[PDB]
Design a protein around this ligand. Structure first.
Ligand code: CHL
Ligand code: CLA
Ligand code: CLA
Ligand code: CLA
Ligand code: CLA
Ligand code: CLA
Ligand code: CLA
Ligand code: CLA
Ligand SMILES: CC(/C=C/C=C(C)/C=C/[C@@]12O[C@]1(C)C[C@@H](O)CC2(C)C)=C\C=C\C=C(C)\C=C\C=C(C)\C=C\[C@@]12O[C@]1(C)C[C@@H](O)CC2(C)C
Ligand SMILES: CC1=C(/C=C/C(C)=C/C=C/C(C)=C\C=C\C=C(C)\C=C\C=C(C)\C=C\C2=C(C)CCCC2(C)C)C(C)(C)CCC1
Ligand code: SF4
Ligand code: SF4
Lengths: 80, 69, 43, 154, 208, 206
């Protein structure tokens, strides 16, 4: 559904995923920062698009980035 | 090199990154990650916050340029 | 008091002081010099 | 006599506006005694109206067919009291406001937390600056020549 | 300017404020609102008290002495309240401008003396002249202090300066009393005094 | 020194070595140094023109009021139709000549060596325009007498100049306003003040 992307400006503060209410994100090891971790987005099918991840990305503009795309029943957040 | 690679701690620096809030604005380098594998070591501290109420951001060495002052 | 003057210098208190003084100025001008459409001095 | 407008000192409908407003204020004047506060205030407003109309007559205002003063802005020397002299009078004050504000923001710019000086207005600083905008048309001109009016990008 | 921690205060039993150490000439600790909590605010209010006191003493004299030597020590004075309506050898707005130009000189020298403690002591025309006043508000010069009484021990000077402002405070009170009297009452102040001394009961502020 | 009101320090951007300083710049106009230089030359020229003005008004009105010559009032003096020449020609001639004067003064202010070096022909006089100073040109054309041959060590002369000129400028503003609300000459207003000083002032104009 939605296309979440994490760019290489991430500092690995784990706010993107601790804010994400649908388990879309997960921190993985990395070698590009002092924290040695970066966020990944495997479960984009569970992405609703609420952008709580990028409302918590403390960078110049953003490192995590949500692109609104094909909306399915779970990205639209329907219990019916 | 083990000696510093980037600007000095306190060197007021300009941002050449086009997507940042402080583009073509000066800053104040508070730290430079001397690890020669990180992509954006230059920790800058600006005076005025961005839209997310943040005054600091990591920048690269090529995305930064020190002023003549 | 230093803090009372710090509060009197705050933006709304100083704004209402400034605009009360200004409004009294323009009011007394439009009472002493009412109904004014043209500047007749060196006209 | 320009733009097809007769002056107000020799207009008929302007005097008719005068007479009509005076009769309107006199119709509201035959309901009180001629020595009480309402009648005195009505007579004061009446004299105010009459002097108003006579002043608009004597300044050379141009009253159209509707009988109201039509201001001329084109730049006619007879009608610089309409726009150009009060326009300069405006721009002098407006640039005063802007210049004292700009010199204030530049004054607090070298502060540790400048924003608190925009909330808590430093009245001594501004008051020392509040008269510095009296000379704005020359100080601003020099700041433009010296390069201090407009900032540089870096 | 020596402190007196156990001086008599305006309101005995109360603790006077910290910014009134007893140093000043006549500080009985009367500052409930805190209008002199700051040091510089206190230094300004001191000279304000001093000059309000002195102007009010000159005012009380020029009100009551022309009203005492008019009702009994027979003279001819118009009044103190309606003296501004009387006419003289100058237009009313003219001599106001003249006394403004002449008083503003001295008051600007005072402004300088308050901002800079010693700046205006040299006569600008004759710099050999001088005012030998170290204390702000008390210029020890010839035109002000020719008799040499404004000098000496700081304790005698302090008791003399509190004598000064003690007379001046009730002078202020007396002048605004004459104001409120000539407003509430029709006649003048000394006539009000005689009407009070005739019947202290049925002569007061109360009329109903 | 004595700077224009005691109790105030002079601004640090002007002090001492300047023609009659006295430290009066409360509105921060001489804060920038080149602005101060331009304003110094402006002041000197303004004061000298104003001094010539006060002389040409006071002298003419001494001749007029006493009755030595039937010269016109300063107020109504511009519309005198001269027989040999017209005002329409005089404005143009003034424009030409005072342009050759003031533009030369300017090009010296921005470049002091100018007007005397190369191709600056003024009837072969390319030496009297040496300048020697900003605001104090010197030379046989401009100071024939040469009372102040030196100009840096002539602080007394320049101080006298600038003080008399500040006072002449203030007197010219006096002539401007005093004779726009009273519509007489300065000498008339003076002898009106020297008859009954306490009854003929500015505020005795109702
Ligand atoms: C400097 C300067 C000043 C202060 C004045 C002042 C005056 N000129 Mg003026 N002039 C000046 C330079 C010049 N004038 C003139 C030619 C004239 C004329 C021809 C007239 C004036 C008039 C006036 C008056 C305009 C009101 C006022 C007294 C007018 C006047 O005298 O009305 C009372 C008028 O008719 N000026 C020439 C050439 C100048 C150079
Ligand atoms: C922007 C549009 C606009 C414009 C252009 C005007 C213009 C005017 N209105 Mg209208 N008005 C407007 C909007 C507008 N109004 C609105 C929105 C309302 C509803 C709030 C009104 C309600 C209204 C009423 C009810 C009245 C007016 C009046 C006036 C007149 C005011 C003249 C006056 O007293 O000034 C005189 C000048 C001053 C008050 C400024 C003085 C400034 C000080 C002295 C500093 C200047 C001196 C300084 C030291 C510099 C000197 C030079 C030297 C020292 C350098 C003028 C024609 C009055 C009038 O007479 O109508 C014709 C009137 O009765 N207006
Ligand atoms: C002209 C007014 C005036 C001023 C500026 C001062 C100033 C001062 N006095 Mg003095 N004083 C005055 C009049 C004044 N006094 C009079 C008239 C009395 C007798 C009633 C006193 C009795 C007095 C005592 C006993 C003491 C002082 C002290 C002081 C100092 C500290 C208090 C302070 O901050 O006062 C600042 C005062 C003002 C800013 C004036 C108040 C203004 C508000 C608007 C008043 C409004 C209410 C008022 C009651 C209405 C007046 C009506 C009137 C007709 C009765 C300061 C130097 C103390 C000190 O250190 O002594 C040296 C002290 O111990 N004063
Ligand atoms: C540029 C013009 C100018 C202006 C506007 C002033 C204005 C003033 N001067 Mg200054 N002064 C000037 C030039 C000027 N001075 C020069 C050139 C000198 C000679 C160096 C002085 C020497 C001087 C002295 C010695 C004193 C003043 C004082 C004053 C004040 C008089 C009080 C008042 O307002 O009376 C209306 C006033 C602020 C007096 C003052 O208040 O002292 C602070 C005072 O004592 N002036
Ligand atoms: C030096 C101070 C002083 C003195 C001696 C007087 C004296 C007098 N006043 Mg005036 N008065 C004063 C201050 C003073 N007043 C002030 C500050 C005000 C403004 C609030 C007034 C307002 C006033 C009015 C409106 C009237 C009088 C009247 C009178 C007379 C009758 C008394 C009366 O009606 O009680 C009223 C008294 C007061 C309101 C004063 C309040 C108390 C003051 C502050 C006490 C002064 C200090 C004192 C010397 C020391 C304490 C004494 C004691 C505790 C040991 C009397 C001659 C009346 C009159 O003319 O009748 C002939 C009258 O109509 N007075
Ligand atoms: C317009 C004529 C003129 C000009 C350009 C100057 C220019 C100057 N004066 Mg001078 N001055 C003048 C007239 C003039 N003066 C007069 C008439 C007086 C007597 C009242 C003085 C008394 C005086 C003193 C005592 C001092 C100066 C000083 C200065 C210098 C620094 C201040 C500054 O930048 O102001 C630049 C001024 C202007 C650009 C003119 C602004 C005019 C406004 C817009 C009109 C206000 C007029 C109104 C009646 C008030 C500068 C070279 C200082 C100095 O010599 O030290 C360097 C100094 O301390 N001036
Ligand atoms: C500077 C200045 C300026 C612009 C003027 C301008 C003028 N002067 Mg004045 N004058 C000045 C300084 C100045 N004067 C000084 C310093 C003296 C001494 C005189 C003495 C003087 C006399 C004696 C006469 C003039 C006259 C005139 C007028 C004609 C001059 C001409 O070229 O013919 C003209 C209005 C003449 C005039 O008023 O017209 C008849 C005239 O008779 N001037
Ligand atoms: C040093 C310059 C100077 C001198 C010597 C005089 C002298 C005089 N003026 Mg002039 N005047 C001047 C500057 C001067 N003024 C300026 C700058 C203005 C513009 C505000 C005026 C505006 C003016 C008017 C509108 C009138 C006078 C009048 C007078 C006379 C009476 C005094 C008076 O009204 O006070 C005026 C004094 C001032 C406005 C103060 C100006 C600054 C002082 C002189 C600087 C201190 C030295 C007197 C002959 C009156 C007259 O005609 O008398 C019969 C009159 O009606 N003057
Ligand atoms: C200067 C003055 C009077 C001056 C009078 C003059 C020149 C009179 C001149 C004339 O009469 C003549 C000669 C002749 C007449 O023909 C003409 C005039 C012209 C009329 C009065 C001041 C009069 C001043 C007065 C009355 C001041 C009262 C202040 C009080 C009570 C303050 C109280 C407090 O401030 C404290 C002390 C401490 C704080 O913490 C708490 C509070 C409570 C706020
Ligand atoms: C005459 C007239 C007219 C017209 C006019 C015109 C057309 C004009 C134009 C004009 C123009 C075309 C202009 C432009 C400009 C530009 C610019 C670019 C500017 C800039 C400026 C600045 C920058 C400034 C600033 C400031 C000041 C000085 C003030 C305050 C402060 C500040 C800082 C804001 C008419 C007929 C209608 C009417 C009458 C009048
Ligand atoms: S919020 Fe942004 S910077 Fe923080 S861990 Fe997530 S992607 Fe990285
Ligand atoms: S948009 Fe919402 S669901 Fe999608 S990754 Fe961001 S926080 Fe998680």
């Amino acid at each position: 559904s939605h296309s979440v992307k994490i760019y290489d400006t991430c500092i690995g503060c784990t706010q993107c995923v601790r804010a994400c209410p649908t388990d879309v994100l997960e921190m993985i090891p990395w070698d590009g920062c002092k924290a040695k971790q970066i966020a990944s987005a495997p479960r984009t099918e569970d992405c609703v698009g609420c952008k709580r991840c990028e409302s918590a990305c403390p960078t110049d503009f953003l490192s995590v980035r949500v692109y609104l795309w094909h909306e399915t029943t779970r990205s639209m957040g329907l219990a019916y | 090199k083990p000696p510093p690679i980037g600007p000095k701690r306190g060197s007021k620096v300009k941002i050449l990154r086009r997507e940042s809030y402080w583009f073509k604005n000066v800053g104040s380098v508070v730290a430079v990650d001397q690890d020669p594998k990180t992509r954006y070591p230059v920790v800058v501290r600006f005076a005025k916050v961005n839209y997310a109420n943040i005054s600091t951001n990591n920048y690269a060495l090529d995305e930064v340029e020190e002023v003549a002052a | 008091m230093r803090d009372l003057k710090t509060y009197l210098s705050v933006a709304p208190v100083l704004s209402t002081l400034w605009f009360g003084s200004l409004a009294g100025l323009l009011i007394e001008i439009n009472r002493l010099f009412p109904d004014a459409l043209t500047f007749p001095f060196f006209s | 006599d320009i733009s097809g407008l007769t002056p107000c000192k020799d207009s008929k409908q302007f005097a008719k506006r005068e007479k009509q407003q005076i009769k309107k204020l006199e119709s509201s004047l035959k309901l009180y005694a001629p020595e009480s506060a309402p009648a005195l205030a009505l007579n004061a407003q009446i004299e105010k109206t009459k002097r108003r109309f006579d002043n608009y007559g004597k300044y050379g205002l141009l009253c159209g067919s509707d009988g109201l003063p039509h201001l001329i802005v084109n730049g006619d020397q007879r009608h610089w009291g309409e726009f150009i002299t009060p326009g300069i009078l405006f721009l002098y004050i407006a640039g005063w406001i802007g210049w004292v504000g700009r010199s204030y923001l530049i004054a607090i710019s070298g502060e540790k937390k400048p924003a608190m000086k925009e909330i808590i207005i430093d009245v001594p600083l501004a008051s020392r600056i509040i008269f510095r905008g009296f000379i704005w048309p020359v100080a601003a001109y020099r700041e433009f020549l010296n390069g201090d009016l407009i900032a540089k990008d870096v | 300017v020596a402190a007196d921690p156990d001086r008599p205060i305006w309101f005995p039993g109360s603790t006077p404020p910290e910014w009134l150490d007893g140093s000043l000439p006549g500080d009985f600790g009367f500052d409930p609102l805190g209008l002199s909590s700051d040091p510089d605010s206190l230094k300004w209010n001191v000279q304000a008290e001093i000059v309000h006191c002195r102007w009010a003493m000159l005012g009380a004299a020029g009100i009551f002495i022309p009203e005492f030597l008019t009702k009994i020590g027979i003279l001819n004075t118009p009044s103190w309240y309606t003296a501004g309506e009387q006419e003289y050898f100058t237009d009313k707005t003219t001599l106001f401008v003249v006394e403004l130009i002449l008083i503003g000189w001295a008051e600007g020298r005072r402004w300088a003396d308050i901002i800079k403690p010693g700046s205006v002591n040299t006569d600008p025309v004759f710099p050999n002249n001088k005012l030998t006043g170290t204390d702000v508000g008390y210029p020890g010069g010839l035109w002000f202090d020719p008799l040499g009484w404004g000098s000496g021990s700081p304790a005698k000077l302090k008791e003399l300066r509190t004598k000064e402002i003690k007379n001046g405070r009730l002078a202020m009170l007396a002048v605004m009393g004459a104001w409120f009297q000539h407003i509430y009452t029709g006649t003048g102040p000394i006539d009000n005094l005689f009407a009070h001394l005739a019947d202290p009961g049925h002569a007061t502020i109360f009329a109903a | 020194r004595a700077t224009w009101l005691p109790g105030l320090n002079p601004p640090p951007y002007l002090d001492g070595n300047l023609a009659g300083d006295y430290g009066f710049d409360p509105l921060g106009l001489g804060e920038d140094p080149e602005s101060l230089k331009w304003y110094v030359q402006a002041e000197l020229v303004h004061s000298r023109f104003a001094m010539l003005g006060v002389a040409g008004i006071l002298f003419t009105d001494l001749l007029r009021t006493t009755g030595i010559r039937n010269l016109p009032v300063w107020y109504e003096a511009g519309a005198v139709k001269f027989d040999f020449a017209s005002t329409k020609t005089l404005i143009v001639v003034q424009f030409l000549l005072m342009g050759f004067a003031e533009t030369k003064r300017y090009m010296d202010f921005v470049s002091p060596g100018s007007q005397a070096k190369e191709g600056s022909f003024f009837f072969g006089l390319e030496a009297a325009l040496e300048g020697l100073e900003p605001g104090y040109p010197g030379g046989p054309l401009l100071n024939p007498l040469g009372l102040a041959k030196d100009v840096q060590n002539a602080h007394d002369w320049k101080l006298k100049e600038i003080k008399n000129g500040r006072l002449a400028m203030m007197a010219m503003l006096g002539f401007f306003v005093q004779a726009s609300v009273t519509h007489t000459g300065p000498i008339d207003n003076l002898v009106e003040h020297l008859s009954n000083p306490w009854h003929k002032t500015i505020i005795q104009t109702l």
